[PDB]
Write a protein that binds this ligand. Structure first.
Ligand SMILES: *[C@@H]1O[C@H](CO)[C@@H](O[C@@H]2O[C@H](CO)[C@@H](O)[C@H](O)[C@H]2NC(C)=O)[C@H](O)[C@H]1NC(C)=O
Ligand SMILES: *[C@@H]1O[C@H](CO)[C@@H](O[C@@H]2O[C@H](CO)[C@@H](O)[C@H](O)[C@H]2NC(C)=O)[C@H](O)[C@H]1NC(C)=O
Ligand SMILES: *[C@@H]1O[C@H](CO)[C@@H](O[C@@H]2O[C@H](CO)[C@@H](O)[C@H](O)[C@H]2NC(C)=O)[C@H](O)[C@H]1NC(C)=O
Ligand SMILES: CCCCC/C=C\C/C=C\CCCCCCCC(=O)O
Ligand SMILES: CCCCC/C=C\C/C=C\CCCCCCCC(=O)O
Ligand SMILES: *[C@@H]1O[C@H](CO)[C@@H](O)[C@H](O)[C@H]1NC(C)=O
Ligand SMILES: *[C@@H]1O[C@H](CO)[C@@H](O)[C@H](O)[C@H]1NC(C)=O
Ligand SMILES: *[C@@H]1O[C@H](CO)[C@@H](O)[C@H](O)[C@H]1NC(C)=O
Ligand SMILES: *[C@@H]1O[C@H](CO)[C@@H](O)[C@H](O)[C@H]1NC(C)=O
Ligand SMILES: *[C@@H]1O[C@H](CO)[C@@H](O)[C@H](O)[C@H]1NC(C)=O
Ligand SMILES: *[C@@H]1O[C@H](CO)[C@@H](O)[C@H](O)[C@H]1NC(C)=O
Ligand SMILES: *[C@@H]1O[C@H](CO)[C@@H](O)[C@H](O)[C@H]1NC(C)=O
Lengths: 339, 411, 170, 48, 48
């Protein structure tokens, strides 16, 4: 996982809704809503920062070579197909299809939530309570383009583009030097080039078959998305708590009591909802720290396995690491480690 | 409240705003009209049949009367009725004119002046234990007034009785009218009174010359429920026309709120009046007059962001409505420049076909900048310079020189 | 925090012990909650700072105390060395690295067939300046005459794809 | 936690339902806050 | 260090003990105990 869902909270909307008296009473707190919004904004900025660190390591966009004469090695499964509206690979398409986001887009209009849909739709209920979801700065198409440039550089230039000034080299000789890097002489690579290319193609096809089947293996991104959705749904659900008041509805209290008698109940509800928001923000901060650690690990792996050959054991797959290929995925990255 | 820029200034607690994009409060729609929907009842509540009754019941045999289908215009009691005690527990008195009551029951009896205080949810005493007990979660109003001019006789009024010597305390809203002989001592009684056996009912004195604590007091306890069931007794509030598909304030059977009312496909059961979602908020209501089901939707909806190049640079701002498609609109204003990117409609920024490095992150691949007249421009961010590698199966590139680079990393 | 005032002095001068007790309790609860929130945020920021400091210590160990082969761990390019510098609440690493500057095109072959046997550079790559073939290191163009001292023989020439014939000096 | 006592048994034996409700609510809020603080600290230590 | 102590909390037992009235009043909160238990279960699974 690389990034998590960025959220914003309208504290007045969540705590009080459309109640003017409740907002006037909540004005006596003030700074807590600002603190929660500041923490949420920091998390949202950190998500885009993590995405940029993981995927925007190189600023030099390399296109797919036309000839595609890589000494029997086949990369069409990890290379984009222009037929798709998004210039992402077939394996990237499989990864995208295996993760279901809470919302397909990011624009839910008022007319779409008008009526009973305000209750049946979870997103409508979240938005009617001041909880909004901010989109990532980089779209999936741009992340796919960054992955495309990285893959093109690592296939056409190998490791040189990671150190700047990409130098072209035939893929057979790149494989020979990578074999030399793991203690195997290059004549072994050159005398078994057909066999090695066939095994690499077979392994790529096996990964494609595994991804196309019911086996997901993408549980981390789905867990992140489900955690964010569950946190938002729990925040919505906690509005039914009385918090020691006569009722959990501000409208009932206002229609049932005068200003003095309703003041204590509204204060209790405000305190409870502020506590719920604080708990949500603290949990979001902890999950953001975990996601930042994961994204730092992903960036390090992208630097040391895709931009070069790593001698660290079990850092870029099991076995003697040869190379790695990046792929975009919903809120995450997928490394194909060739060893 | 002047503009989103001023809202951001207030939120930041500063008069100057740095360049960037700031989330403001969600889009708010103020109500336009106020509507009241009460069931059409013209008959007045039987105030004369309750507070003007010629004869009242004893406290041990307190009378319970059902009140239904009436308007509780208690101001008519202002002319002739003076009440020493009027305490409401589950409702504020000042709201009594703006509410509808579900199950109105009036419990009438006569007690001593000193025993009026015992008519409360959590009191102890002779009346509270053996005659009349109020529930702990009692919702209603207790009214008591001196009736020395009515329930007192020169020779002594003995028509009012109270229960003494009960085995156990009465349950809330429970009536005990048995006349069995009480057994105070260990000797069993056989329907006769003597020594440790006494009649459980004792009569009040109630003479005109008695003290104010020994004078008769008529007590009426009104018990009802609020804002949970259809209800048939309503306050003296005039109903207005029903307004749909508009953001209005509504008063449905005493339940007040703000929102938009739309026709509902929900089929309410005959005993149901209100519908609530998983957040316990009233999202559906049955009209007391037309008997139709209406969905209630909050007026405020949609996130709003404000993009500024910095107050030290210019006062021009752009507004992004994250839940508005610009293709009336739920926007504060629509001035000239309308782009309608992904992630909302952008108003106040000029779209350009050129791609630059991101300056102010709008989102969904869209960024904003302050360019040169100076204005805010929105564009698609550029991932980097386009390149091609002259790949071949027999061609290599080898460096002939080098550069000793020294970079800085801050940790 | 729901009290009549945010000042304890005003409440104490305005109410007796019993009436001021609830207001003081509300203020105490609110201020304790504020302190708890501050401490939690400080703990999260301290965890982030500890991660950053662990990264800084690792970089000091692997870039200043030695030469790192990890890509982009001690600067962009081929890492040569690093120099530490103190800074307010932080460290500044000056990473000295080697970057290729002037690339040139060459015609390259995987192996050379001299006498029916395949030869391999064993250190770099075979290149041609148009008519003659040399062997040079990959990161710097230093052409050398292809001899048996800078080549090794493995197998025949009928298996290697792209092998060309050229003279290997003895 | 601002209540008359920290023992629910004493409050229940000392007050009726209405009067004890506020004290029990105060105790519930305080103990829930303590549990929340413990869980947050456990989460931070688990991340470490 | 590799793992830490895995803990579980019975929120009703901690807040109210054997008090039935306190549990009835705590029923008006509900989701907070579930959230705390979910976080604790996540920590316990993360330890293993
Ligand atoms: C590289 O792999 C692709 C498969 O991803 C090969 O495309 C297949 O080609 C065969 C016949 O050549 C077709 O029957 C399949 O339907 C193709 N699969 C596709 C398009 O997904 C491609 O031929 C391989 N490259 C080489 C040089 O063999
Ligand atoms: C080394 O392993 C490879 C791959 O497992 C072997 O190649 C296989 O050889 C059998 C016949 O012995 C064929 O049926 C398979 O199709 C081959 N596999 C592939 C991927 O080409 C190889 O024989 C083994 N031994 C040597 C000396 O290379
Ligand atoms: C309701 O009636 C029951 C039964 O008639 C009462 O329970 C009895 O209480 C007496 C003492 O008060 C005992 O001696 C009996 O053994 C009990 N019988 C049973 C079957 O429980 C009960 O007290 C009455 N409740 C009220 C409020 O009057
Ligand atoms: C005939 C009984 C109808 C009861 C309807 C239910 C709720 C309506 C509420 C209160 C009505 C009684 C008010 C008595 C005191 C009047 C004001 C005063 O003098 O201080
Ligand atoms: C002789 C004194 C013994 C005191 C023992 C200590 C606590 C016992 C409590 C209360 C006893 C006095 C009750 C007076 C009111 C009775 C009920 C009523 O009429 O409303
Ligand atoms: C109660 O009776 C008195 C005397 O007959 C009368 O003046 C008054 O209007 C009556 N009030 C009601 C509410 O009937
Ligand atoms: C009065 O209310 C009844 C509901 O029982 C309704 O059927 C009727 O139309 C209403 N009359 C008017 C004039 O609104
Ligand atoms: C807005 O609506 C039009 C159709 O009227 C649609 O084509 C467009 O995609 C919508 N905008 C977004 C951002 O989806
Ligand atoms: C090598 O030749 C190609 C054209 O075949 C050219 O695009 C490329 O710039 C050349 N490389 C160098 C380093 O001159
Ligand atoms: C290639 O190099 C050799 C030796 O340096 C030289 O004799 C020859 O002329 C060169 N050829 C070209 C085309 O530069
Ligand atoms: C490159 O491909 C051509 C095909 O026309 C072939 O003749 C040549 O030998 C190949 N060179 C290498 C080094 O593989
Ligand atoms: C190299 O020699 C072999 C056999 O002598 C011959 O088949 C081949 O064509 C030669 N290479 C070239 C480029 O002519």
């Amino acid at each position: 996982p690389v990034s998590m869902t960025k959220t914003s909270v309208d504290c007045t909307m969540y705590i009080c809704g459309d109640s003017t008296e409740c907002s006037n009473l909540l004005l006596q707190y003030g700074s807590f809503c600002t603190q929660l919004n500041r923490a949420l904004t920091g998390i949202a900025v950190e998500q885009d920062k993590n995405t940029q660190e993981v995927f925007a390591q190189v600023k030099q966009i390399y296109k797919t070579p036309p000839i595609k004469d890589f000494g029997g090695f086949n990369f069409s499964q990890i290379l984009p197909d222009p037929s798709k509206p998004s210039k992402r690979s077939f394996i990237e398409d499989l990864l995208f299809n295996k993760v279901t986001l809470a919302d397909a887009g990011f624009i839910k209009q008022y007319g779409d939530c008008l009526g009973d849909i305000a209750a049946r739709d979870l997103i409508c209920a979240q938005k009617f309570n001041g909880l909004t979801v901010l989109p990532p700065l980089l779209t999936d198409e741009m992340i796919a383009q960054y992955t495309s440039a990285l893959l093109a550089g690592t296939i056409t230039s190998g490791w040189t583009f990671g150190a700047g000034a990409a130098l072209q080299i035939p893929f057979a000789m790149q494989m020979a030097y990578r074999f030399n890097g793991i203690g195997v002489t290059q004549n072994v690579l050159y005398e078994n080039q057909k066999l090695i290319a066939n095994q690499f193609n077979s392994a790529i096809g096996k990964i494609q078959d595994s991804l196309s089947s019911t086996a997901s293996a993408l549980g981390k991104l789905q867990d992140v998305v489900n955690q964010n959705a569950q946190a938002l749904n729990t925040l919505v659900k906690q509005l039914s708590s009385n918090f020691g008041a006569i009722s959990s509805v501000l409208n009932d209290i206002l229609s049932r009591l005068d200003k003095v008698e309703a003041e204590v109940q509204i204060d209790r509800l405000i305190t409870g909802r502020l506590q719920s928001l604080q708990t949500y923000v603290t949990q979001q901060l902890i999950r953001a720290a975990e996601i930042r650690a994961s994204a730092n690990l992903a960036a390090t792996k992208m630097s040391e396995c895709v931009l070069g050959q790593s001698k660290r054991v079990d850092f870029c797959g099991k076995g003697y690491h040869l190379m790695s290929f990046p792929q975009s995925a919903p809120h995450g990255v997928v490394f194909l480690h060739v060893t | 409240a002047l503009d989103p820029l001023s809202e951001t200034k207030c939120t930041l607690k500063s008069f100057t705003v740095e360049k960037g994009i700031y989330q403001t409060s969600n889009f708010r729609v103020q109500p336009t009209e106020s509507i009241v929907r009460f069931p059409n009842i013209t008959n007045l509540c039987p105030f004369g049949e309750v507070f003007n009754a010629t004869r009242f019941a004893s406290v041990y045999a307190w009378n319970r009367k059902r009140i239904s289908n009436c308007v509780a215009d208690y101001s008519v009691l202002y002319n002739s009725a003076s009440f020493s005690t009027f305490k409401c527990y589950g409702v504020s008195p000042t709201k009594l004119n703006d509410l509808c009551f579900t199950n109105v029951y009036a419990d009438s009896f006569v007690i001593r002046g000193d025993e009026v205080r015992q008519i409360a949810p959590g009191q102890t005493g002779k009346i509270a234990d053996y005659n009349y007990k109020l529930p702990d979660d009692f919702t209603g109003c207790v009214i008591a007034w001196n009736s020395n001019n009515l329930d007192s006789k020169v020779g002594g009024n003995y028509n009012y009785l109270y229960r003494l010597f009960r085995k156990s305390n009465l349950k809330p809203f429970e009536r005990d009218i048995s006349t069995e002989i009480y057994q105070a001592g260990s000797t069993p009684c056989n329907g006769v009174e003597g020594f440790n056996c006494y009649f459980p009912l004792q009569s009040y004195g109630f003479q005109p010359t008695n003290g104010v604590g020994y004078q008769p007091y008529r007590v009426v306890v009104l018990s009802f429920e609020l804002l949970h069931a259809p209800a048939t007794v309503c306050g003296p509030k005039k109903s207005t026309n029903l307004v749909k598909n508009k953001c209005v304030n509504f008063n449905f059977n005493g339940l007040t709120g703000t929102g938009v009312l739309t026709e509902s496909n929900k089929k309410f059961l005959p005993f149901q009046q209100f519908g609530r979602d998983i957040a316990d908020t009233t999202d559906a209501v049955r009209d007391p007059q037309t008997l139709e089901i209406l969905d209630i939707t909050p007026c405020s909806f949609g996130g709003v962001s404000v993009i500024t190049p910095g107050t030290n640079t210019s006062n021009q701002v752009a507004v992004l409505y994250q839940d508005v498609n610009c293709t009336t609109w739920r926007v504060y204003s629509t001035g000239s420049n309308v782009f309608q990117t992904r992630a909302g409609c952008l108003i106040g920024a000029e779209h350009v076909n050129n791609s630059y490095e991101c300056d102010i992150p709008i989102g969904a691949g869209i960024c904003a900048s302050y360019q040169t007249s100076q204005s805010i421009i929105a564009y698609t961010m550029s991932l980097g310079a386009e390149n091609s590698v002259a790949y071949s199966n027999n061609s290599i590139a080898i460096p002939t020189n080098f550069t000793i680079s020294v970079t800085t990393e801050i940790l | 925090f729901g009290a009549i005032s945010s000042v304890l002095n005003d409440i104490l001068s305005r109410l007796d012990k019993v009436e001021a007790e609830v207001q003081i309790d509300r203020l105490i609860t609110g201020r304790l909650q504020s302190l708890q929130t501050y401490v939690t945020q400080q703990l999260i920021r301290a965890a982030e700072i500890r991660a950053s400091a662990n990264l800084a210590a690792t970089k000091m160990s692997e870039c200043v105390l030695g030469q790192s082969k990890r890509v982009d761990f001690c600067g962009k390019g081929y890492h040569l060395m690093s120099f530490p510098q103190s800074a307010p609440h932080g460290v500044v690493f000056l990473h000295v690295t080697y970057v290729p500057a002037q690339e040139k095109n060459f015609t390259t072959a995987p192996a050379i067939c001299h006498d029916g046997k395949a030869h391999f550079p064993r250190e770099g790559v075979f290149v041609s300046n148009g008519t003659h073939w040399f062997v040079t290191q990959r990161n710097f163009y230093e052409p050398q005459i292809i001899t048996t001292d800078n080549t090794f023989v493995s197998g025949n020439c009928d298996v290697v794809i792209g092998i060309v014939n050229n003279t290997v000096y003895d």
